[PDB]
Amino acid sequence: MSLNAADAADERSRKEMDRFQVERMAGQGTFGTVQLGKEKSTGMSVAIKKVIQDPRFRNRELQIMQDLAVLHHPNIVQLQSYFYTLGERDRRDIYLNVVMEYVPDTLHRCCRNYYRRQVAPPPILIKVFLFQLIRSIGCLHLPSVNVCHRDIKPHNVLVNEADGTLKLCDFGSAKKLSPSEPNVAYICSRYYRAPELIFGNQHYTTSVDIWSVGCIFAEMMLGEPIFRGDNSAGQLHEIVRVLGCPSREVLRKLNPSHTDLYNSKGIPWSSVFCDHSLKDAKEAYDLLSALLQYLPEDRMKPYEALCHPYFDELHDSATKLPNNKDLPEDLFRFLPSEIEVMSEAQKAKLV
Ligand SMILES: Cc1ncc(-c2ccnc(Nc3ccc(S(C)(=O)=O)cc3)n2)n1C(C)C
Numbered sequence: 600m601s602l603n604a605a606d607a608a609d610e611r612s613r614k615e616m617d618r619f620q621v622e623r624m625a626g627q628g629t630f631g632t633v634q635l636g637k638e639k640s641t642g643m644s645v646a647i648k649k650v651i652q653d654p655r656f657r658n659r660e661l662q663i664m665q666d667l668a669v670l671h672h673p674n675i676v677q678l679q680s681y682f683y684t685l686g687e688r689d690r691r692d693i694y695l696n697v698v699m700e701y702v703p704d705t706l707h708r709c710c711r712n713y714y715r716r717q718v719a720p721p722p723i724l725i726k727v728f729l730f731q732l733i734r735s736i737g738c739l740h741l742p743s744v745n746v747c748h749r750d751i752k753p754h755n756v757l758v759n760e761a762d763g764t765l766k767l768c769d770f771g772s773a774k775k776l777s778p779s780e781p782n783v784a785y786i787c788s789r790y791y792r793a794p795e796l797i798f799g800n801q802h803y804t805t806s807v808d809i810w811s812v813g814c815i816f817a818e819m820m821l822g823e824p825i826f827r828g829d830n831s832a833g834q835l836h837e838i839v840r841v842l843g844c845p846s847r848e849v850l851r852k853l854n855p856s857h858t859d860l861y862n863s864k865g866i867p868w869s870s871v872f873c874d875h876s877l878k879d880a881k882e883a884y885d886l887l888s889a890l891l892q893y894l895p896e897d898r899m900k901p902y903e904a905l906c907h908p909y910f911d912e913l914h915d916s917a918t919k920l921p922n923n924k925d926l927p928e929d930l931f932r933f934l935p936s937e938i939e940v941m942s943e944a945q946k947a948k949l950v
C-alpha cells in the first residue's frame with residue numbers, strides 16, 4: 600500500500616513517493632512496469648511507471664511529459680509526479696518513475712476483445728476514438744508544442760471504452776524536430792513506420808505521426824495491422840501491395856539518394872476490410888486514404904481531418920456510445936493554443 604521509502608534514491612524522491620499508495624500491478628513489458636496507485640490527497644487513480652531507458656537511444660519521456668503538462672490536453676496523459684527508485688533485483692540500478700492519471704485499457708486490448716469474440720468494434724467507438732487520437736496529434740504538432748511522438752501504436756493509445764475517452768502516452772521516443780537537424784530513421788514499430796522512415800531519411804516531419812494514425816484507423820477496422828512486413832523492404836512491399844505502387848517521381852522524392860519494386864495496382868479498401876454494414880464506408884475510406892499518402896506533405900493535417908465529414912455525427916447530441924452513454928463532454932472543448940491556430944472554417948466547424 601505505502602511505497603517503500605527505502606527504495607527512494609533520494610530525499611526529493613522519498614517525498615514524491617509519500618504522495619502515492621500502490622494498489623496493484625497494471626502491466627509490465629519492454630518499457631518497464633506500470634502500477635495502479637492512488638494519489639492519497641485526492642483518491643485519484645494514477646499510473647506509476649518505472650521507465651527502463653535503452654542507453655543506445657535518447658529517452659525524452661520526462662522532459663516531453665513536463666512540456667505537455669502545461670497544456671492540460673484532454674487526449675494526452677498529464678504528468679503528476681516524477682521520482683527515482685533503486686532497482687528490485689539489483690539496488691545499484693536507479694530508475695526514473697513518472698506518475699500520470701490511470702486509463703483502464705489500451706486501444707490494442709479494447710479492439711482485440713471485439714475481434715476475439717468475432718465482432719468488429721462498433722463503428723461509433725472507432726469514430727470517437729479516431730477523432731480523439733487525431734486531436735492528440737493535432738496538439739502535439741502545434742507550432743507552440745512541436746512534438747513528434749514517433750512511436751504511435753495501438754499499444755500506447757489508452758482508452759476507456761465505457762465513456763469513449765482516449766489519451767496518448769509513451770513519449771520516450773518523442774522529439775521536437777527541425778528541418779535543419781537530423782534524426783534516427785529507425786524509430787517506431789515497423790508496422791506503423793511511414794515510407795520516408797522505411798527509406799532511412801534522417802530529416803522528416805511530424806507527418807510521420809499522421810501515417811501511424813492512419814495505420815491505426817485501418818487496424819481498428821481490420822483486426823490486425825494492415826502493413827505487416829518482416830523487414831524494411833518487406834514493409835515497403837506490404838504498403839505497395841495494398842496502396843498500389845506510387846509514381847517514380849514520388850519514389851525518387853522518398854529515396855534519399857533520389858535514384859525498384861513490383862508495380863501493384865493496390866487493393867480497394869472494401870476488399871481489405873470486407874465491411875458491408877459500415878453505412879459511411881465511403882467517408883471512412885476517403886479519410887483513411889487522405890491520412891495514408893506516400894508523400895508526407897500530402898497527408899491530411901489533424902485539424903483538417905477533424906472537420907472531415909466522417910466525423911459529422913459526433914456533432915449530434917442524439918449520437919450515443921454503444922452503452923447508450925453521451926459522447927465525451929471534452930470532444931469539442933479546444934485549448935486556446937489550438938483555437939488561435941485554426942482557420943476560420945475549422946473554428947466554425949469545431950468550436
Ligand atoms: C507504456 C505506458 N506508459 C504509460 C502507460 C499508462 C498510462 C496510464 N494508464 C495506463 N494504464 C494501463 C496500463 C497497462 C495496461 S495493460 C499492460 O494491462 O495493457 C492497461 C492500462 N498505462 N503505459 C501503458 C500503455 C502500458
Ligand SMILES: C[As](C)(=O)[O-]
Binds near residue numbers: 781
Ligand atoms: C538520436 As534522436 C533522433 O532521439 O535525437
